[PDB]
Amino acid sequence: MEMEKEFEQIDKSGSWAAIYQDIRHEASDFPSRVAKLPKNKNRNRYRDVSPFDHSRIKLHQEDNDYINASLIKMEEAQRSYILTQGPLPNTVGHFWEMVWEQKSRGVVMLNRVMEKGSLKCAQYWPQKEEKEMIFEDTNLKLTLISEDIKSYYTVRQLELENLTTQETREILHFHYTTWPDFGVPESPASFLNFLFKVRESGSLSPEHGPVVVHCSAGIGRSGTFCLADTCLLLMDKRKDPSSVDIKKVLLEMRKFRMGLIQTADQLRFSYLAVIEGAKFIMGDS
Ligand SMILES: CC(=O)N1C[C@@H](CO)[C@@H]2Oc3ccc(Cl)cc3[C@@H]21
Ligand SMILES: CC(=O)N1C[C@@H](CO)[C@@H]2Oc3ccc(Cl)cc3[C@@H]21
């Protein structure tokens, strides 16, 4: 079926939970043996969210190459994403090592450091120009260059230096700051505006390594971001945009990381975002 009318048909019939449970039943199951080794316990935030072995990002280290991060490679859309958990106190150096080694331009953050009164990720970037951060375990230096605070998101320019070679690179930090503590946003307008700002920066383009996107576990909000982006790109590429099947795209992405889209409300919100976005790309919003 088309998307917008499939959407109203699920609303009128109130069957979002059944649709979402079907997706959970059909999703791929691949091994995640490296994630479960005892030496990696303090490298995982949640015991039930792990990268598959076949798609995990490897650090360029011989001691321990493990990080909780996955490469999502979308062949028809010609887009790749790295989805990862929010960094832990003992993985902030690994996180920036990955950004460096994978040649990423941008980092997309979809959570606040504290939500619901609890810590959701480490404070892993510097908050003042004159107070830079040094990660001694991976030999990197990180400096805040500029910060632009807007009503729904903040963009930061960061300098990452490999202290071993003295090479430097500019990284863009795109921080969506207004996702609610509970539930999903009422309107997708600010989330779509944010997606378009990431696109306009070059951070999703083939002349760079894959964007790094995270929330707390790296599957819920993070899944919504890449699912919406890929579906909109396919609608632009194909002769028949109504052929884009958001459930099929989501199942394809779940071949590369488990659990993407965590609730039926996140699934409905993803439909809403693609539907509204497809009107702005052309003229009927
Ligand atoms: C650094 C810079 O000049 N630019 C312009 C665009 C590509 O030329 C990129 O989009 C953004 C957005 C936000 C920030 Cl802080 C920087 C950028 C980049
Ligand atoms: C492409 C798209 O569908 N959308 C949805 C709009 C809000 O409904 C978003 O913000 C922008 C801004 C500029 C452009 Cl070209 C596209 C958009 C987004």
Q: What is the residue extent of each domain of the chain?
A: 1-285
Distance set, CA 26 to CA 21, 76, 90, 155, 259 (Å): 9, 21, 35, 37, 12
Cβ(104)–Cβ(171) under 8 Å? yes
The answer regarding whether domain 1-285 maps to CATH 3.10.20.340 reads no
- Atom 5 of ligand 2: nearest residue by CA position: 277
Pairing of strands 118-119, 133-135: unpaired
Q: Return the ligand number nearest the Cα of 200.
A: 1
Cα(111)–Cα(97) distance, integer angstroms: 21
**What is the 91 CA–ligand 2 centroid distance (Å)?**
35
* Nearest CA-CA partner of 229 in 207, 213, 217: 213
Supply the DSSP symbol for 151.
Answer: S
Residues in contact with 141: Cβ distance below 8 Å, sequence separation at least 6, in sequence order:
132, 133, 134, 135, 159, 160, 161, 163
**What is the 193 CA–ligand 2 centroid distance (Å)?**
6
| 56 assigned binding-site residue | no
Helix, strand, coil tally for the chain in percent (to 5): 35, 25, 45
- Atom 8 of ligand 1: nearest residue by CA position: 201
Determine the 3-state secondary structure of 215 from DSSP: coil
Experimental method, per PDB record: X-ray
Six token digits for residue 207: 């002349």
Other CB atoms closer than 10 Å to residue 186's CB: what's the count?
Answer: 9
Q: Return the ligand number nearest the Cα of 106.
A: 1
* Ligand 1 atom having least distance to the Cα of 170: 1
Which residue spans within 35-95 are E strands per DSSP? 56-58, 66-74, 79-84
Distance set, CA 166 to CA 140, 159, 220 (Å): 10, 12, 37
Pocket test for ligand 1, best of 125, 172, 208 (most atoms within 8 A of CB): 172
Amino acid identity of residue 19, one-letter, is: I
Six token digits for residue 98: 């990955």
| 220 assigned binding-site residue | yes
Residues in contact with 264: Cβ distance below 8 Å, sequence separation at least 6, in sequence order:
16, 17, 19, 20
Cβ(103)–Cβ(211) under 8 Å? no
DSSP string, 2-14: -HHHHHHHHHHHT
| 277 assigned binding-site residue | no
Residue that is written with structure tokens 């997606």 in the block: 195
Amino acid identity of residue 212, one-letter, is: V
Amino acid identity of residue 89, one-letter, is: P
Other CB atoms closer than 10 Å to residue 204's CB: what's the count?
Answer: 22
Cβ(214)–Cβ(110) under 8 Å? yes
Cβ(34)–Cβ(43) under 8 Å? no
Q: Return the ligand number nearest the Cα of 208.
A: 1
Question: At 112, phi and psi to the nearest 5?
Answer: -95, 155
- Atom 7 of ligand 1: nearest residue by CA position: 201
Pairing of strands 211-214, 106-109: parallel
**What is the 127 CA–ligand 2 centroid distance (Å)?**
30
Active site residue 226: no
Residues in contact with 93: Cβ distance below 8 Å, sequence separation at least 6, in sequence order:
135, 136, 137, 138, 140
Terminal-residue alpha carbon distance, the chain = 21
Cα(56)–Cα(271) distance, integer angstroms: 28
Cα(124)–Cα(143) distance, integer angstroms: 11
Cα(69)–Cα(52) distance, integer angstroms: 9
| 181 assigned binding-site residue | yes
- Atom 10 of ligand 2: nearest residue by CA position: 193
